[PDB]
Amino acid sequence: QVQLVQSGVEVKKPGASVKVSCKASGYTFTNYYMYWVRQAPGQGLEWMGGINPSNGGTNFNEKFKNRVTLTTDSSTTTAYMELKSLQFDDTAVYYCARRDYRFDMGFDYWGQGTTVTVSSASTKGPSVFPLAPCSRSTSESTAALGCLVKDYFPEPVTVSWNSGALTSGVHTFPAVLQSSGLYSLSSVVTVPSSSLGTKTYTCNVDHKPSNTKVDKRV
Amino acid sequence: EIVLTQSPATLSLSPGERATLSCRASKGVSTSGYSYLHWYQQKPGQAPRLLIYLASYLESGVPARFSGSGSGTDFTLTISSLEPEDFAVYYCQHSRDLPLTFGGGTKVEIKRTVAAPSVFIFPPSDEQLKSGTASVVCLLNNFYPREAKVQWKVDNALQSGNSQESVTEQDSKDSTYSLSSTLTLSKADYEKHKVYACEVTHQGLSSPVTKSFNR
């Protein structure tokens, strides 16, 4: 059924090691070579190594030599990727891709991806602050309000507005990583200025890793 | 070692016009009548998807709308009639030698008539300042092209390196961006000034817009 499935998300400290798995199913396992590709957040792709499951031979990008171990298991049709002495720039999405062993006809099939995050930060719930204009109302019909979700680790957060009833014209921005190692993002909404004192507007912020849920209103 | 440089970084057309991408290798990736050059399509948040392999050959299941060509060391991915799904990133990769490398990708976007952003400024919230930090948010909503010079500006001296931008992925119905710049100060350094202005420069504006507040 020609589809690879990778292991769960990983959050490691610098100097630690991570072992990602890639389970193949429904093709002749030893009839395809396995390659590992990674991609740092919002960047291009970087090849790490390749493995031949029939005998265990390996290819290596030299940037990871003696830092990466690629292993295979014919019994469970599962390839592994172990990245040791993790660095901060190793934060990326790690893929496994298969390639025909008869000849290279491209990486036809890829796994869903495993996100690995290397940081010295500890899990922390976000602080939420209102985004409201300094002085409400000129006669311009549409005003903008929102919430600032700041100082949390790690990703991700889910922001909804007014218990999810209001979604028209909502922009929750991609989280950015601050100097402290904590992510921060904003949730924006444009509404009628006429229906500002009339209606009530709340963002509800959920960060399940920290188990923190906070309702804030503007 | 071989590097591939896709030219150029970004294109943008309406769901119909011909799309032509380029992949431009440092050295020769063609040998014995075979070019170790493949093309993948990646939409945000998902694994890449191979379309053309070995320069010319098309991967099964992929529409004939895509076509690969070129040889020796010059290659071109050609898309003729686009659909809404087709707008994404496209990478080329070589297998001529080790290590395997990828192009930086080419992002194809939806070109619209230039739209001007609605600018909004946000002061820090009483809740946040007594925690000891002041965060000022400037919001740009619905604007094309993406290039926007967002300058933070505090009491007629220019702020440098204390802000962060964040650009949405193109929204679906409008395919225009939205941006949010956040400036961070210590609350102490924050209350030693008065006017906090966000100067937005954009093509779809005859002149820059300034949104400000007084503390």
Added chain:
Amino acid sequence: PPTFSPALLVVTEGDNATFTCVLNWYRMSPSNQTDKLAAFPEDRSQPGQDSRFRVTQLPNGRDFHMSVVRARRNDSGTYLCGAISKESLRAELRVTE
């Protein structure tokens, strides 16, 4: 289909061995287990490829040379070549000490 000759080849250890068959060169293991050793053209991205297995091309005649250098005793076994763009019949090699 190509010929892949000789139908069986016997050589001494350390002595080269060559057959005459994209073009792939497999050795056959059990239960339909097959592993490619070399290929024309050379496969660069093949993990752990054994350099002693070469597949030079002759001038012409669609002639090819499947050469295994400095043979080992365990190199003896079951070899065939195929063309991809159909197997060719099974030609053998035994290694003597």
